[PDB]
Amino acid sequence: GSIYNYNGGCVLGMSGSNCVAIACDLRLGANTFTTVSTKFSKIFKMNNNVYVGLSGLATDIQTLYEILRYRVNLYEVRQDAEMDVECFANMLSSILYSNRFSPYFVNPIVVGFKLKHYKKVNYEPYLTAYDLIGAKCETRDFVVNGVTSEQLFGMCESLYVKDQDENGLFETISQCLLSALDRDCISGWGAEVLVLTPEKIIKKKLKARMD
Amino acid sequence: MARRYDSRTTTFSPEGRLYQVEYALEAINNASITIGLITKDGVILGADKVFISKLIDKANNYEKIYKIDKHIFCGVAGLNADANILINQSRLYAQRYLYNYNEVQPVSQLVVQICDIKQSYTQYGGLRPYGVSFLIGGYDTKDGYQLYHTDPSGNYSGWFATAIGTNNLTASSVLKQEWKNDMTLEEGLLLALKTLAKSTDTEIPKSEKIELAYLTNKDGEVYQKYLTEKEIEELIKLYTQKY
Amino acid sequence: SMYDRHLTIFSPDGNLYQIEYAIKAVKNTNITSVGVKGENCAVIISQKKMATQYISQDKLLDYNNITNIYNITDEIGCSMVGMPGDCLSMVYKARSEASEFLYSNGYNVNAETLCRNICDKIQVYTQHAYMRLHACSGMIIGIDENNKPELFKFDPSGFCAGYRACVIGNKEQESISVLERLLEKRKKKIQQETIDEDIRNTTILAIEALQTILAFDLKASEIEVAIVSTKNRNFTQISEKEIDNYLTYIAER
Amino acid sequence: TTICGLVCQNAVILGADTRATEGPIVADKNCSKLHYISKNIWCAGAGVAGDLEHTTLWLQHNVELHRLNTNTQPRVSMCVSRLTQELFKYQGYKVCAIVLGGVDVNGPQLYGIHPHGSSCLLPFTALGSGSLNAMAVLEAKYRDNMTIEEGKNLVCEAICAGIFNDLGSGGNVDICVITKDSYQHIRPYKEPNMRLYHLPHPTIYPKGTTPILSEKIEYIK
Amino acid sequence: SAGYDLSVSTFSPDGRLYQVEYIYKSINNNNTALCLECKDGIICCCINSNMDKNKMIKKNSYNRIYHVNNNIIITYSGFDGDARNIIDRARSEANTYYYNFHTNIPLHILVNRISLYIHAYTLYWHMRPFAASIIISSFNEKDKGDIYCIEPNGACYKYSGIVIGKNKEMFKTEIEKKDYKDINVRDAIEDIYKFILTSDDHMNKNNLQNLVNFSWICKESSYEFQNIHEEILTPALNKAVEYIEKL
Amino acid sequence: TTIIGIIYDNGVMLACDSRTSSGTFISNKCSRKINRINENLYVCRSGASAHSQKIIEIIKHYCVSMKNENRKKGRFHEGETIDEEIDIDSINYLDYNNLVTKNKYFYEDKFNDYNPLVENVAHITKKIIYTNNNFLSCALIFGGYDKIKKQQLYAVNLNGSIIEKHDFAVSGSGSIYIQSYLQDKYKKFMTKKECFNLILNCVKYAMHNDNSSGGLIRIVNITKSFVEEFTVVNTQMNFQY
Amino acid sequence: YSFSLTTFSPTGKLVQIEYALNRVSSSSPALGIRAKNGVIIATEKKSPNELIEENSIFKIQQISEHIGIVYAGMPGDFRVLLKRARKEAIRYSLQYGSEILVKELVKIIASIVQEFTQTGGVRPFGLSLLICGVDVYGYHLYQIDPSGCYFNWMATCVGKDYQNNMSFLEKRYNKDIEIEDAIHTAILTLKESYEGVLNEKNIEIGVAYDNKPFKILTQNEIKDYLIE
Ligand SMILES: */C(=C\S(C)(=O)=O)[C@H](Cc1c[nH]c2ccccc12)NC(=O)[C@H](CC(C)C)NC(=O)[C@H](Cc1c[nH]c2ccccc12)NC(=O)CN1CCOCC1
């Protein structure tokens, strides 16, 4: 759970050919059925190649984001380098399990790029999903989390297409998110979709249902 | 009797002075020169590199200028190990402020915290002070571009242009007679090169012994650049043409 | 300064004089111990003598109780030389280390690991000024999981090393030469021997080394011999009768 | 989950399924349940995935530290002691049922460890929700001194039984063969489940079909 | 010396602990305490000759012999406070051992634990080492008698007869003239009185009966700690005085 | 679970079943409930497996410490120097059926110079169990030999009490069914064969009547100089009627 | 009570750190060379007597895969710092799932070493450390001094006659040398420093090259290298 139902919210992540995408619902709820905000973003940028989508209790989302920003900033200032996506994923797992017996009520996903050096650099899409105590699912196609997990799983199982350009990836992820949100009472009121490409990030707000 | 071995570091002297702090200041003044100045385009921090050997990895190796945050950076004069300890602490402090307030710490506040650490060391306990002095430059939207100088006692003061380390009197004279309220980044860099050459007692600076960095605020973001050898060499060619 | 030799702080030349003084204190006890390593066995021989100190050897003193050899576990043994209180303290520290290792890891510590842990404990004494150095130098013998004899020696300075043969005593270089000669003589034999013959030869070599180093005839009652081997992995003392048999054999051969 | 292990001649063979479940929903289709503790020691986990992952990582790194310090080969008994002491300390609230198998000086060894901190040395074992089906297979077919190939086939059969008879088990069969000198981790080993129906063509949405309110483009430098 | 004897945690350039040596001097200058193993028991005697000028002390009130479990004698020579502290620790160790294992602590285990306790105070630069030498003894039928002496440096040694404090050389010389393994404690009392009279020059027939403590563990006392009754001590005192007056 | 201990004329015999079950499922078919603390000291465990196992590990650590501290300095016993066999193969023979079912080892400490005492180990175990009787729930039977009290049996009961038994001790769910059988059949100064048969029959009856008791039977015979161990697999109970 | 035993002198120096440096400079020599595709650390490990077991003395040690450490100074200090470095490496691994970075490990150990020049009741560590490693950012050779300062070296030597050894190594070091050339140059430098004649029993070598696990060369491999 009821604590997740208190606010609602859902995050989704998909991979394409040399691009990734992370989408979220923009609602903030109260008592499971009162909408107080329609611009509560659940996607946070850690660095150029790492994004985290946090869904769950809003206070826990904000707290976890502050902790993660603190840790990432310290790591990056010390190493004089951007934090690796795998390193961030493992650190998030360990942070979540550090509160094993009084956990943060947040179900996160990590979406980004793994950089491989040879001259040029290769960008490999990277997706992970978590449960509230840091159990990690590393995936190559799509990751979901939130109260809309079942709907998102169904939509992504049916509609995900491997190795799509940024345009097809955006269309697929947005369609999945919108169809999954249309069936959830406590999620929706706008959708935000980010498409990551090695050279640019495209941020779009979807014309969604507001009921 | 373990007290026979105590040196009583945190104790006043007949003249109302702290011998340990005075000796730490002597060490700082023996250290190599670190200059800083403020232009209308940013804060420039320069330092003289002390030669150890040509087997030292000179690429991607800045040892006298460090980044404390995206909007704060510092130059060091004194003991490198003490400086590293204090720099790690300052980075922790800046990140703690961001964690607490969701905004970046002001440069004055960070300086106050690190100087408070130093003062506490000089007052409490029986441990020696830190043999390091800082030139902390930064930018924030409250006070603009800022440059501060901190000493082992915990004292700090704000400056428009200053120098610490060995032969800082010559650098201070050069900056006093050359620095201007409105300067461009290139002009400030050239002045920094001139003062470094004067302090080092040389005419043509050598890029192998110069550390240069500048912190600017452009397009709504604070950007720090630590000039490489080739960039410093281009600057030195410009300086050679100028003088 | 005025305390570079009083505390464990560096002297201008870079020395720590308190460690050297602790080594001298160990050397002043005038107790000699010799450890030898065989093919499948290790032997430690020591004097059943009281370390020279403020008190002397009384007529009513029980001489069986005088010993510089201890069991750390059932299968690990040691000989400790130095100030007797320090030696007892070190023996108890080693026993507690071995027991903690056994409980924590589900198997028995080996001699190398025990010696290294003891030296890690000694380093703290060398580095902190508020505590005295333990004037104790130790030999440790055991058998490892691969069935090889292990003989290690640690000194007050926190230095440990494995040896084919070692000696704690006042004279060191001549003792080293004596042990080298004995080991070369043993290696000059080219015929493989049984476990019992190896045990007997290692024990004889240790007894002969101690006799040569001390330069006087040894009585079985004034020396103590302990052994560990593959046949019997328990660190066990050999009887005075066996010691006397070995001494008579050495004299007659 | 269906994890299992058995001892064959001079080797220990562990097997696992690859399904992680969040209630009635499959949260992960290809999760890895066999974890490397050391070159000669591996484990298979059942129970709460977060507890299992954290505990196995902690055990692996502590064992590596111990190996570096002692300069000797890690011991299955040491792993058992550490794991059981931790689990007992937490009184079964770290829900970790582990099949720990490895080869050391004492030869091949297989242990079953339960969340409350009990352990047992076994010739074969199975844990998880499919443990009863796997145990049926193992009890029916196990014998001493099986060849490595026979042990691999038996572990595959046990894991397949668990996969196809337990609703909390599925995915592929992962196997690990541990000897005194090497380990072979085959992932996947069977791959017995795949989606059986596919549409004639994938559904590609035409460009511009999704209505948008705003679009901001930023360039990464 | 030369600045190296101002602390117990510093060795001198010749590897010595002068603070412990000074403690040894202090103990040697103190009252006498001897223990003697006999055929049927052990006798512990304490000669408090230092109080020959304290004429207002309650008679026989000052005792330096204690017991641990009613079957272990423990006496000392040195500072009363330090010895009392060490005896309290010995009793504490005995209590803990019984709590843990439901049997009495063995004598050698207790001796080792007390040696470690005493040795711990010779290691740090902020604690004062104990200035006391301890004698811990016991007797039973099967094992006969066990006597241990613990020095201020933490060294414990086993004896069949021990003397600590002042005049200990003379006392040892007189004790070693006979083998007490084949003498009974009742007969040894007279010998000890003679030894005291001959050795200690501050002791006479007048003050023998109020400056001497006598305890034993023997078959007569059921192998449990006892103080020797005046009815047994007085005839021996008279005989010893008579003999020494004869010669 | 069934654990038994019996004192016969020349030693002490411990026996146990080997079934560990989580309710009605048998998690371990053949567990090891008689465990060696020292060469001359054994414990039979009953109750929660985790509790008894962790307690026994702690007690083994303590007993190692005690044995090390029990050693005296010097040499000893220089002039001093320190029967019917069970037909285990015949006992185990089954018509319808490299198997090792018997072990024997002699004590290294022949004179019991440093071996800890059975009472000492039992009482430290009791103290540990009593300090945490709010959590721990296990029952133990210590069987041992020491030169002071010879062969001994100590029962450490649930809640942390200790009772020394001079005839026999039983524990576990299956012991209830054989309580009167053992009381009727026990006698003082039994021979080794009589004690072996009696204890084997007790475990067999307990396993026949108790669902929590099963598997094979493990027996340990502790004497003055050695310890023997047997495994019995012919555990089926056959009644004429 | 705890007070600093290392204090500033009237001229602004820490004589205790100076004396620790004196101990290091009197100790035996060690060196490290960064090659084009790897990094080696060599050290001179003489045998004080024929009875010691050379295989028991460990001067070149492995902190983790792809990270090795050698020292010049006091073996007890080295063992303490080596245990601490291994603990820090596994702590980083537990946090971040990957192996620790050489720069991060060097910074942590340098801070630990610094703490002992300022805290109360302790003396500074009497050794210099050479830490070689490989990570995604390349090949690293770092030196750590008793003061807690660390230096990034292309090639370096610590211990006895380190000035002469550094001059000799600089006269024949270029950044483009290979692993074989680096090993040859290391053996040459050790031979030049050592009085007498060198042999495989007197030296130890560790290599981290081509993203392979850190390796400690055996006596046979060192003999093969010394044949030339
Ligand atoms: C076996 C099943 S079982 C019935 O025998 O318990 C598996 C074993 C398993 C799964 N994954 C791994 C990885 C490594 C080793 C072993 C593994 N166990 C499970 O799948 C768990 C069974 C439940 C009954 C405990 N499931 C989980 O732990 C869930 C995993 C999960 C949920 N959402 C996710 C998103 C991404 C990745 C993983 C997951 N987690 C939970 O049920 C969360 N609860 C929250 C409360 O505290 C306990 C864990």
PDB file of N, CA, C and O in Angstrom, chain A residues 48 97 100 133 135-137 150 157 159 167 171 174-175 199-207, chain D residues 25 28-29 48 50-51 54 93-94 205 207-220:
ATOM      1  N   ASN A  48      26.513  12.126 -18.016  1.00  0.00           N
ATOM      2  CA  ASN A  48      26.083  12.119 -19.410  1.00  0.00           C
ATOM      3  C   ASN A  48      25.594  10.750 -19.856  1.00  0.00           C
ATOM      4  O   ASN A  48      24.713  10.660 -20.716  1.00  0.00           O
ATOM      5  N   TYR A  97      20.753  -2.170  -0.374  1.00  0.00           N
ATOM      6  CA  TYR A  97      20.824  -3.245   0.607  1.00  0.00           C
ATOM      7  C   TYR A  97      21.358  -2.776   1.953  1.00  0.00           C
ATOM      8  O   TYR A  97      21.147  -3.460   2.957  1.00  0.00           O
ATOM      9  N   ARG A 100      18.639  -2.792   4.495  1.00  0.00           N
ATOM     10  CA  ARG A 100      17.913  -4.024   4.210  1.00  0.00           C
ATOM     11  C   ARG A 100      16.698  -4.187   5.115  1.00  0.00           C
ATOM     12  O   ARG A 100      15.623  -4.585   4.656  1.00  0.00           O
ATOM     13  N   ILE A 133      15.487  -3.764  -2.065  1.00  0.00           N
ATOM     14  CA  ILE A 133      16.672  -4.127  -1.295  1.00  0.00           C
ATOM     15  C   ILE A 133      17.845  -4.479  -2.208  1.00  0.00           C
ATOM     16  O   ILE A 133      18.727  -5.233  -1.815  1.00  0.00           O
ATOM     17  N   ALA A 135      18.223  -6.115  -5.183  1.00  0.00           N
ATOM     18  CA  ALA A 135      18.300  -7.223  -6.125  1.00  0.00           C
ATOM     19  C   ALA A 135      18.239  -6.670  -7.541  1.00  0.00           C
ATOM     20  O   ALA A 135      17.356  -5.873  -7.863  1.00  0.00           O
ATOM     21  N   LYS A 136      19.169  -7.098  -8.387  1.00  0.00           N
ATOM     22  CA  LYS A 136      19.425  -6.453  -9.667  1.00  0.00           C
ATOM     23  C   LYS A 136      19.141  -7.405 -10.818  1.00  0.00           C
ATOM     24  O   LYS A 136      19.576  -8.560 -10.799  1.00  0.00           O
ATOM     25  N   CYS A 137      18.421  -6.909 -11.818  1.00  0.00           N
ATOM     26  CA  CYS A 137      18.138  -7.628 -13.054  1.00  0.00           C
ATOM     27  C   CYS A 137      18.765  -6.854 -14.206  1.00  0.00           C
ATOM     28  O   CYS A 137      18.292  -5.769 -14.556  1.00  0.00           O
ATOM     29  N   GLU A 150       2.981  -4.681 -14.303  1.00  0.00           N
ATOM     30  CA  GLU A 150       2.364  -5.750 -15.084  1.00  0.00           C
ATOM     31  C   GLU A 150       1.961  -5.257 -16.467  1.00  0.00           C
ATOM     32  O   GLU A 150       2.227  -5.915 -17.481  1.00  0.00           O
ATOM     33  N   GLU A 157       6.610  -6.968 -23.723  1.00  0.00           N
ATOM     34  CA  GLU A 157       6.718  -8.304 -24.290  1.00  0.00           C
ATOM     35  C   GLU A 157       6.085  -8.357 -25.670  1.00  0.00           C
ATOM     36  O   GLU A 157       6.605  -9.020 -26.573  1.00  0.00           O
ATOM     37  N   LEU A 159       5.398  -5.660 -27.823  1.00  0.00           N
ATOM     38  CA  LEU A 159       5.702  -4.625 -28.799  1.00  0.00           C
ATOM     39  C   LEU A 159       7.181  -4.310 -28.957  1.00  0.00           C
ATOM     40  O   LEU A 159       7.547  -3.669 -29.945  1.00  0.00           O
ATOM     41  N   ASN A 167      14.196   7.034 -33.606  1.00  0.00           N
ATOM     42  CA  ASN A 167      12.800   7.362 -33.881  1.00  0.00           C
ATOM     43  C   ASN A 167      11.882   6.190 -33.561  1.00  0.00           C
ATOM     44  O   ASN A 167      10.867   6.350 -32.869  1.00  0.00           O
ATOM     45  N   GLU A 171       9.074   5.888 -30.548  1.00  0.00           N
ATOM     46  CA  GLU A 171       7.680   5.539 -30.793  1.00  0.00           C
ATOM     47  C   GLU A 171       7.275   4.320 -29.978  1.00  0.00           C
ATOM     48  O   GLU A 171       6.211   4.310 -29.349  1.00  0.00           O
ATOM     49  N   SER A 174       7.193   5.157 -26.087  1.00  0.00           N
ATOM     50  CA  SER A 174       6.069   6.024 -25.766  1.00  0.00           C
ATOM     51  C   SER A 174       4.747   5.281 -25.885  1.00  0.00           C
ATOM     52  O   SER A 174       3.858   5.459 -25.047  1.00  0.00           O
ATOM     53  N   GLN A 175       4.591   4.443 -26.911  1.00  0.00           N
ATOM     54  CA  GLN A 175       3.357   3.679 -27.039  1.00  0.00           C
ATOM     55  C   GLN A 175       3.187   2.716 -25.876  1.00  0.00           C
ATOM     56  O   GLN A 175       2.095   2.604 -25.305  1.00  0.00           O
ATOM     57  N   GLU A 199      25.623  11.331 -28.990  1.00  0.00           N
ATOM     58  CA  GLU A 199      25.928  12.729 -29.253  1.00  0.00           C
ATOM     59  C   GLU A 199      24.880  13.710 -28.751  1.00  0.00           C
ATOM     60  O   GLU A 199      25.189  14.898 -28.640  1.00  0.00           O
ATOM     61  N   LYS A 200      23.663  13.265 -28.452  1.00  0.00           N
ATOM     62  CA  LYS A 200      22.632  14.196 -28.014  1.00  0.00           C
ATOM     63  C   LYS A 200      21.566  13.454 -27.223  1.00  0.00           C
ATOM     64  O   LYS A 200      21.451  12.230 -27.291  1.00  0.00           O
ATOM     65  N   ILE A 201      20.792  14.229 -26.469  1.00  0.00           N
ATOM     66  CA  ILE A 201      19.658  13.739 -25.695  1.00  0.00           C
ATOM     67  C   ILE A 201      18.421  14.493 -26.158  1.00  0.00           C
ATOM     68  O   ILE A 201      18.436  15.724 -26.246  1.00  0.00           O
ATOM     69  N   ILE A 202      17.359  13.755 -26.459  1.00  0.00           N
ATOM     70  CA  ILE A 202      16.087  14.327 -26.886  1.00  0.00           C
ATOM     71  C   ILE A 202      15.090  14.135 -25.754  1.00  0.00           C
ATOM     72  O   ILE A 202      14.821  13.002 -25.342  1.00  0.00           O
ATOM     73  N   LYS A 203      14.542  15.238 -25.254  1.00  0.00           N
ATOM     74  CA  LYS A 203      13.547  15.222 -24.191  1.00  0.00           C
ATOM     75  C   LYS A 203      12.197  15.611 -24.769  1.00  0.00           C
ATOM     76  O   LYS A 203      12.070  16.663 -25.401  1.00  0.00           O
ATOM     77  N   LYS A 204      11.192  14.774 -24.544  1.00  0.00           N
ATOM     78  CA  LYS A 204       9.863  15.015 -25.073  1.00  0.00           C
ATOM     79  C   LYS A 204       8.822  14.804 -23.988  1.00  0.00           C
ATOM     80  O   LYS A 204       8.935  13.887 -23.172  1.00  0.00           O
ATOM     81  N   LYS A 205       7.817  15.669 -23.984  1.00  0.00           N
ATOM     82  CA  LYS A 205       6.628  15.497 -23.167  1.00  0.00           C
ATOM     83  C   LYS A 205       5.504  15.013 -24.068  1.00  0.00           C
ATOM     84  O   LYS A 205       5.252  15.604 -25.121  1.00  0.00           O
ATOM     85  N   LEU A 206       4.850  13.933 -23.664  1.00  0.00           N
ATOM     86  CA  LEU A 206       3.816  13.313 -24.473  1.00  0.00           C
ATOM     87  C   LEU A 206       2.458  13.915 -24.152  1.00  0.00           C
ATOM     88  O   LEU A 206       2.162  14.235 -23.000  1.00  0.00           O
ATOM     89  N   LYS A 207       1.636  14.066 -25.182  1.00  0.00           N
ATOM     90  CA  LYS A 207       0.239  14.439 -24.998  1.00  0.00           C
ATOM     91  C   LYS A 207      -0.506  13.218 -24.478  1.00  0.00           C
ATOM     92  O   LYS A 207      -0.894  12.336 -25.244  1.00  0.00           O
TER      93      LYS A 207
ATOM     94  N   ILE D  25       4.529 -12.822 -10.767  1.00  0.00           N
ATOM     95  CA  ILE D  25       5.074 -12.203 -11.969  1.00  0.00           C
ATOM     96  C   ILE D  25       6.558 -12.513 -12.054  1.00  0.00           C
ATOM     97  O   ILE D  25       7.279 -12.434 -11.055  1.00  0.00           O
ATOM     98  N   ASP D  28      12.551 -11.541 -13.597  1.00  0.00           N
ATOM     99  CA  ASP D  28      13.762 -11.773 -14.371  1.00  0.00           C
ATOM    100  C   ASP D  28      13.674 -13.158 -14.985  1.00  0.00           C
ATOM    101  O   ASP D  28      13.408 -14.132 -14.278  1.00  0.00           O
ATOM    102  N   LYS D  29      13.896 -13.241 -16.295  1.00  0.00           N
ATOM    103  CA  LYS D  29      13.823 -14.510 -17.001  1.00  0.00           C
ATOM    104  C   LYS D  29      15.156 -15.234 -17.072  1.00  0.00           C
ATOM    105  O   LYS D  29      15.171 -16.449 -17.291  1.00  0.00           O
ATOM    106  N   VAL D  48      15.561 -15.060  -0.880  1.00  0.00           N
ATOM    107  CA  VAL D  48      15.473 -13.641  -1.206  1.00  0.00           C
ATOM    108  C   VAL D  48      16.704 -13.246  -2.012  1.00  0.00           C
ATOM    109  O   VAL D  48      17.839 -13.353  -1.533  1.00  0.00           O
ATOM    110  N   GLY D  50      18.058 -10.434  -3.088  1.00  0.00           N
ATOM    111  CA  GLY D  50      18.960  -9.409  -2.592  1.00  0.00           C
ATOM    112  C   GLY D  50      19.876  -9.923  -1.501  1.00  0.00           C
ATOM    113  O   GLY D  50      21.084  -9.663  -1.511  1.00  0.00           O
ATOM    114  N   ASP D  51      19.317 -10.672  -0.550  1.00  0.00           N
ATOM    115  CA  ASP D  51      20.138 -11.280   0.487  1.00  0.00           C
ATOM    116  C   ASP D  51      21.163 -12.223  -0.119  1.00  0.00           C
ATOM    117  O   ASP D  51      22.336 -12.205   0.265  1.00  0.00           O
ATOM    118  N   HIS D  54      23.989 -10.165  -1.986  1.00  0.00           N
ATOM    119  CA  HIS D  54      24.880  -9.475  -1.063  1.00  0.00           C
ATOM    120  C   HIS D  54      25.760 -10.463  -0.311  1.00  0.00           C
ATOM    121  O   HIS D  54      26.976 -10.268  -0.198  1.00  0.00           O
ATOM    122  N   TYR D  93      16.650 -14.192   9.183  1.00  0.00           N
ATOM    123  CA  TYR D  93      16.043 -13.049   8.520  1.00  0.00           C
ATOM    124  C   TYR D  93      16.749 -12.690   7.224  1.00  0.00           C
ATOM    125  O   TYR D  93      16.190 -11.939   6.420  1.00  0.00           O
ATOM    126  N   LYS D  94      17.955 -13.200   7.008  1.00  0.00           N
ATOM    127  CA  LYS D  94      18.557 -13.238   5.679  1.00  0.00           C
ATOM    128  C   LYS D  94      18.169 -14.580   5.078  1.00  0.00           C
ATOM    129  O   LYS D  94      18.760 -15.611   5.398  1.00  0.00           O
ATOM    130  N   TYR D 205       5.720   1.064 -35.392  1.00  0.00           N
ATOM    131  CA  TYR D 205       4.824   2.206 -35.412  1.00  0.00           C
ATOM    132  C   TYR D 205       5.280   3.216 -36.461  1.00  0.00           C
ATOM    133  O   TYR D 205       6.474   3.514 -36.557  1.00  0.00           O
ATOM    134  N   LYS D 207       6.215   6.727 -38.077  1.00  0.00           N
ATOM    135  CA  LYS D 207       6.789   7.907 -37.452  1.00  0.00           C
ATOM    136  C   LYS D 207       5.727   8.982 -37.267  1.00  0.00           C
ATOM    137  O   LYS D 207       4.870   9.190 -38.130  1.00  0.00           O
ATOM    138  N   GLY D 208       5.789   9.669 -36.130  1.00  0.00           N
ATOM    139  CA  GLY D 208       4.851  10.729 -35.842  1.00  0.00           C
ATOM    140  C   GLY D 208       3.506  10.271 -35.334  1.00  0.00           C
ATOM    141  O   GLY D 208       2.600  11.100 -35.208  1.00  0.00           O
ATOM    142  N   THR D 209       3.343   8.980 -35.040  1.00  0.00           N
ATOM    143  CA  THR D 209       2.050   8.484 -34.583  1.00  0.00           C
ATOM    144  C   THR D 209       1.771   8.889 -33.143  1.00  0.00           C
ATOM    145  O   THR D 209       0.606   8.998 -32.748  1.00  0.00           O
ATOM    146  N   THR D 210       2.810   9.108 -32.346  1.00  0.00           N
ATOM    147  CA  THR D 210       2.636   9.523 -30.962  1.00  0.00           C
ATOM    148  C   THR D 210       2.529  11.041 -30.896  1.00  0.00           C
ATOM    149  O   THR D 210       3.437  11.732 -31.373  1.00  0.00           O
ATOM    150  N   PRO D 211       1.460  11.600 -30.333  1.00  0.00           N
ATOM    151  CA  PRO D 211       1.398  13.055 -30.166  1.00  0.00           C
ATOM    152  C   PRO D 211       2.250  13.516 -28.996  1.00  0.00           C
ATOM    153  O   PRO D 211       2.289  12.882 -27.940  1.00  0.00           O
ATOM    154  N   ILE D 212       2.938  14.636 -29.191  1.00  0.00           N
ATOM    155  CA  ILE D 212       3.834  15.178 -28.181  1.00  0.00           C
ATOM    156  C   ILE D 212       3.429  16.612 -27.880  1.00  0.00           C
ATOM    157  O   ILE D 212       2.865  17.311 -28.724  1.00  0.00           O
ATOM    158  N   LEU D 213       3.715  17.041 -26.654  1.00  0.00           N
ATOM    159  CA  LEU D 213       3.457  18.412 -26.240  1.00  0.00           C
ATOM    160  C   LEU D 213       4.641  19.325 -26.512  1.00  0.00           C
ATOM    161  O   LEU D 213       4.458  20.449 -26.988  1.00  0.00           O
ATOM    162  N   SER D 214       5.852  18.864 -26.218  1.00  0.00           N
ATOM    163  CA  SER D 214       7.042  19.683 -26.371  1.00  0.00           C
ATOM    164  C   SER D 214       8.226  18.781 -26.676  1.00  0.00           C
ATOM    165  O   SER D 214       8.203  17.580 -26.401  1.00  0.00           O
ATOM    166  N   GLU D 215       9.262  19.378 -27.256  1.00  0.00           N
ATOM    167  CA  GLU D 215      10.471  18.647 -27.614  1.00  0.00           C
ATOM    168  C   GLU D 215      11.663  19.563 -27.410  1.00  0.00           C
ATOM    169  O   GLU D 215      11.789  20.576 -28.100  1.00  0.00           O
ATOM    170  N   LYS D 216      12.527  19.207 -26.468  1.00  0.00           N
ATOM    171  CA  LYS D 216      13.770  19.917 -26.217  1.00  0.00           C
ATOM    172  C   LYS D 216      14.925  18.994 -26.566  1.00  0.00           C
ATOM    173  O   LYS D 216      14.981  17.862 -26.080  1.00  0.00           O
ATOM    174  N   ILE D 217      15.838  19.468 -27.407  1.00  0.00           N
ATOM    175  CA  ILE D 217      17.005  18.699 -27.821  1.00  0.00           C
ATOM    176  C   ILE D 217      18.246  19.361 -27.246  1.00  0.00           C
ATOM    177  O   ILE D 217      18.448  20.570 -27.410  1.00  0.00           O
ATOM    178  N   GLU D 218      19.071  18.569 -26.574  1.00  0.00           N
ATOM    179  CA  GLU D 218      20.332  19.022 -26.013  1.00  0.00           C
ATOM    180  C   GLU D 218      21.454  18.165 -26.573  1.00  0.00           C
ATOM    181  O   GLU D 218      21.268  16.970 -26.818  1.00  0.00           O
ATOM    182  N   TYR D 219      22.614  18.775 -26.780  1.00  0.00           N
ATOM    183  CA  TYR D 219      23.760  18.091 -27.360  1.00  0.00           C
ATOM    184  C   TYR D 219      24.758  17.750 -26.266  1.00  0.00           C
ATOM    185  O   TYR D 219      25.124  18.609 -25.458  1.00  0.00           O
ATOM    186  N   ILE D 220      25.188  16.498 -26.242  1.00  0.00           N
ATOM    187  CA  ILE D 220      26.138  16.014 -25.251  1.00  0.00           C
ATOM    188  C   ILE D 220      27.540  16.244 -25.791  1.00  0.00           C
ATOM    189  O   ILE D 220      27.848  15.867 -26.928  1.00  0.00           O
TER     190      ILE D 220
END
